[PDB]
Symmetry: D2
Subunit: 115 residues, 4 copies
Amino acid sequence: CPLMVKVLDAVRGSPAINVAVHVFRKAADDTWEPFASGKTSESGELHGLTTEEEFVEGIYKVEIDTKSYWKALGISPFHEHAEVVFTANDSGPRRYTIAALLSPYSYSTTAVVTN
Amino acid sequence: CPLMVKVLDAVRGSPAINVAVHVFRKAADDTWEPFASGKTSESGELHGLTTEEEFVEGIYKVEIDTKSYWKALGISPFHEHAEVVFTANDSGPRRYTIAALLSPYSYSTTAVVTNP
Amino acid sequence: CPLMVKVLDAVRGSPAINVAVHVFRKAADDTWEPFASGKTSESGELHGLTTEEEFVEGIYKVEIDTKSYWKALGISPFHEHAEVVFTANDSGPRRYTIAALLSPYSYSTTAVVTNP
Amino acid sequence: CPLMVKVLDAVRGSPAINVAVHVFRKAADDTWEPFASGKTSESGELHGLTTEEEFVEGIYKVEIDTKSYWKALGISPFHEHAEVVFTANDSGPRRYTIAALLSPYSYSTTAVVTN
Ligand SMILES: O=C(O)c1cccc(/C=C/c2ccc(B(O)O)cc2)c1
Ligand SMILES: O=C(O)c1cccc(/C=C/c2ccc(B(O)O)cc2)c1
């Protein structure tokens, strides 16, 4: 599991469940090509997106469909989605956790990168 | 204005209005002595808490009454309040803005510290 | 000033100065058209990006160039930039402040939306 | 594990390891009495602080010694510590995760409360 995504709900104090997540890899012509996707689990986590062999160095975008999440709760949100854009860098044998903490008009994201 | 507090609401996308704020300073006997208090304005800002003369070196606690805020709005929040504890002015006088961003089960606080 | 961007530095406890900001608007063909750009001032604020007339209904992307900011400071950050994507003015004109708080491996963004 | 604490470092993108954490329970005279304490692990987590039998309803304070953490990294921080103060409420059979994300001049804390 080189790449894991975790989404939390700051309004209800819970995992953000059944949130759609799309990962893209930046192509040579600067466009975003689909790479992997899924929905967060009951624990707010999305595992199994990719493998060590497939996850090469490059620029990646993680798009979290926050708008649909809030609308399913009857809450009008600000953002269309949350986007996290980063470079994967091999300098070391490591795993990336992209975590996002969601509010209707705000979100915060951090990377936990470990060996 | 050596000490300012600003509070935002992450549910409403607005300033957090009418938030009570209590400031304490640690005394020589290690207890928290009341130092200043007030509430945020329509802009979510609290000015005029203290003066350059009275805001001496020390350890200060800024207590933001988030529970009263959310409850006054009919929401049941997780935290009792948000506490910001810091040493101030120990390299001479600085100006401090304490900012807080509130959600019912989460808050974040940052400080902007400038040299006048 | 219908659109303002403010950026703070959580490592330094200061405004984030000289941060480049690019704004895009989604076009009819679903591509991102350049809309406005600038950089944050000494106060960490970026004013004058647009006007009430030109800031029409649409989907906007505010790209904050956090990597260039941290690298200009000799730090190697995680993110390429911070992107804030939102529908604006679809219930009539509003004023938007987009705030971002930056660390090398983390950022948070909030919006304050007011009705003039 | 009714109560777990997790601490993350936003500067290095890692767990915050070997961070001292003290939990207090508010006593009838409004004073804070020591309840439980420990140091975060290699994963930034502190488990085993208390038990279901001991963790009754009441007001609790979790104090995270952020100052020592940053000083051990040669970074001058703003806060003396991070304090998280909350009421434990039985309305439901649940577990509390108190998470904190640390920067030198800022911190953010969220509660993830689950069954
Ligand atoms: O704490 C966070 O997570 C956070 C995140 C994103 C933005 C902010 C805003 C801070 C702020 C600081 C000072 C002023 B001011 O001097 O008027 C206004 C806003 C705070
Ligand atoms: O963004 C904020 O404001 C914020 C605030 C408080 C905590 C967090 C992080 C939560 C988290 C929990 C577990 C993992 B993990 O699977 O190692 C990672 C992150 C983020």
